[PDB]
Design an enzyme around this catalytic site. Structure first.
Site, mmCIF file in Angstrom:
data_model
loop_
_atom_site.group_PDB
_atom_site.id
_atom_site.type_symbol
_atom_site.label_atom_id
_atom_site.label_comp_id
_atom_site.label_asym_id
_atom_site.label_seq_id
_atom_site.Cartn_x
_atom_site.Cartn_y
_atom_site.Cartn_z
ATOM 1 N N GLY A 90 1.073 -1.030 0.012
ATOM 2 C CA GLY A 90 -0.105 -0.075 0.067
ATOM 3 C C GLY A 90 0.741 1.190 -0.202
ATOM 4 C CB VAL A 133 4.371 -0.328 1.790
ATOM 5 C CG1 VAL A 133 5.203 -1.260 2.782
ATOM 6 C CG2 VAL A 133 4.565 1.345 2.634
ATOM 7 C CD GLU A 143 9.377 -6.431 13.066
ATOM 8 O OE1 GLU A 143 9.482 -5.769 13.846
ATOM 9 O OE2 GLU A 143 9.175 -7.662 13.099
ATOM 10 C CG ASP A 169 -3.747 -3.442 8.055
ATOM 11 O OD1 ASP A 169 -5.044 -3.659 8.188
ATOM 12 O OD2 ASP A 169 -3.529 -3.015 6.977
ATOM 13 C CG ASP A 178 -0.720 9.419 9.726
ATOM 14 O OD1 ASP A 178 -2.180 9.576 10.060
ATOM 15 O OD2 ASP A 178 -0.643 9.189 8.413
ATOM 16 C CE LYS A 211 -2.584 5.808 8.069
ATOM 17 N NZ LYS A 211 -2.490 7.246 7.022
ATOM 18 C CG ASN A 223 -0.253 3.957 9.939
ATOM 19 O OD1 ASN A 223 -0.307 5.021 10.263
ATOM 20 N ND2 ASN A 223 -0.266 3.370 8.571
HETATM 21 O O1 LIG Z 1 5.152 -5.449 7.347
HETATM 22 C C1 LIG Z 1 5.365 -4.073 7.495
HETATM 23 O O2 LIG Z 1 6.682 -3.874 8.073
HETATM 24 C C2 LIG Z 1 4.655 -2.958 6.941
HETATM 25 C C3 LIG Z 1 5.157 -1.627 6.924
HETATM 26 C C4 LIG Z 1 4.332 -0.731 6.516
HETATM 27 N N1 LIG Z 1 4.764 0.762 6.458
HETATM 28 O O3 LIG Z 1 4.221 1.617 6.015
HETATM 29 O O4 LIG Z 1 6.003 0.889 6.859
HETATM 30 C C5 LIG Z 1 2.903 -0.747 6.011
HETATM 31 C C6 LIG Z 1 2.432 -2.152 5.923
HETATM 32 C C7 LIG Z 1 3.055 -3.178 6.479
HETATM 33 N N2 LIG Z 1 2.764 -4.474 6.692
HETATM 34 C C8 LIG Z 1 1.611 -5.007 5.817
HETATM 35 C C9 LIG Z 1 0.692 -5.577 6.573
HETATM 36 C C10 LIG Z 1 -0.977 -5.930 5.975
HETATM 37 C C11 LIG Z 1 -0.880 -6.188 4.376
HETATM 38 C C12 LIG Z 1 -0.218 -7.508 4.114
HETATM 39 C C13 LIG Z 1 -0.060 -8.295 2.787
HETATM 40 C C14 LIG Z 1 -0.489 -7.414 1.736
HETATM 41 C C15 LIG Z 1 -1.393 -6.143 2.145
HETATM 42 C C16 LIG Z 1 -1.142 -5.747 3.369
#
Ligand SMILES: O=C(O)c1cc([N+](=O)[O-])ccc1NCCCc1ccccc1
Ligand SMILES: O=C(O)c1cc([N+](=O)[O-])ccc1NCCCc1ccccc1
Length: 254
Positions: free
Chosen positions: A9, A12, A53, A58, A99, A101, A104
């Site tokens: 998203g 990322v 990591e 989420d 921020d 939410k 996040n």
């Molecule tokens: O795993 C991180 O470190 C991380 C970091 C950020 N960020 O904005 O840094 C944002 C999301 C992050 N995980 C994603 C967890 C949900 C997810 C999983 C698979 C596909 C779509 C969505």
């Protein structure tokens, strides 16, 4: 250096180094800081990329997946307690999130939740930010977390504004239009207007109904208008709401 897996998203991506990581395309002092409730910053690359990591889900997705039954109160309580531990750590190192939410907030199969996507779409914004305060404090994060707490309990956003003024007026309609009595100096805020409508404060047990008096008391302290009265993360951890806190394991579909 990285095999892209998918877009999560700036942007990322889930990427493979054989380590699976989150790669953000757009500080280094943060790499040396460590807490179980804060996403680990692995690398900074400027050629700006941040490597974090990876966690699989989420809180926004989990709340959507839980919408028809709701998240169990012991898990809501565990998540709120852990997020407050993360904020207490951040704030003690003079780091703000700014921020917070649900999207996040990252969760794993072990029952943990972690702060991510630091600010280093308006629904969680503290009123002093909306009113143009330039030097806002750690209290902005407690406000956002209170909004998220309410949303976990009721399964609807507390203040779902669609503009800055709609956000402000949604807050005012629930908590009352602030005045100098409850918020000294509010009428001197940069974006305060004497022409704001004056709404009375609604009864608080109408706002997050099923929640017990311990949770409503804590929420009320997290949503105080005056940032100087708003509860700190450290003080919130001592609140009677957490006397029976546990760490349940959530049902995650990945
Ligand atoms: O795993 C991180 O470190 C991380 C970091 C950020 N960020 O904005 O840094 C944002 C999301 C992050 N995980 C994603 C967890 C949900 C997810 C999983 C698979 C596909 C779509 C969505
Ligand atoms: O989470 C982001 O997306 C992010 C973005 C930027 N940046 O400058 O864009 C910089 C840092 C960022 N996270 C760092 C998380 C590690 C951390 C946070 C608080 C205290 C101790 C350790």
């Amino acid at each position: 250096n990285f095999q892209k897996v998918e877009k999560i998203g700036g942007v990322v991506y889930k990427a493979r180094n054989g380590e699976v990581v989150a790669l953000k395309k757009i500080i280094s002092l943060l790499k040396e800081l460590n807490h179980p409730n804060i996403v680990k910053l692995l690398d900074v690359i400027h050629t700006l990329y941040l490597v974090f990591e990876f966690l699989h889900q989420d809180l926004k997705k989990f709340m959507d997946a839980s919408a028809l039954t709701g998240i169990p109160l012991p898990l809501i309580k565990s998540y709120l307690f852990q997020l407050l531990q993360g904020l207490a750590f951040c704030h003690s190192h003079r780091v703000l999130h700014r921020d917070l939410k649900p999207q996040n907030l990252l969760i794993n199969t072990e029952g943990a939740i972690k702060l991510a996507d630091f600010g280093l779409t308006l629904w969680y914004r503290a009123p002093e930010i909306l009113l143009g305060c330039k030097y806002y404090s750690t209290a902005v994060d407690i406000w956002s977390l209170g909004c998220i707490f309410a949303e976990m309990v009721t399964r609807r956003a507390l203040f779902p504004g669609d503009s800055e003024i709609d956000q402000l007026f949604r807050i005012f309609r629930t908590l009352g239009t602030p005045d100098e009595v409850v918020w000294p100096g509010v009428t001197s805020m940069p974006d305060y207007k004497p022409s704001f409508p004056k709404w009375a404060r609604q009864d608080f047990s109408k706002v997050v109904p099923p929640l017990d008096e311990d949770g409503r008391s804590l929420l009320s302290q997290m949503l105080h208008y005056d940032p100087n009265k708003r509860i700190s993360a450290k003080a919130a951890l001592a609140h009677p709401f957490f006397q029976d806190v546990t760490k349940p394991v959530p049902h995650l579909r990945l």
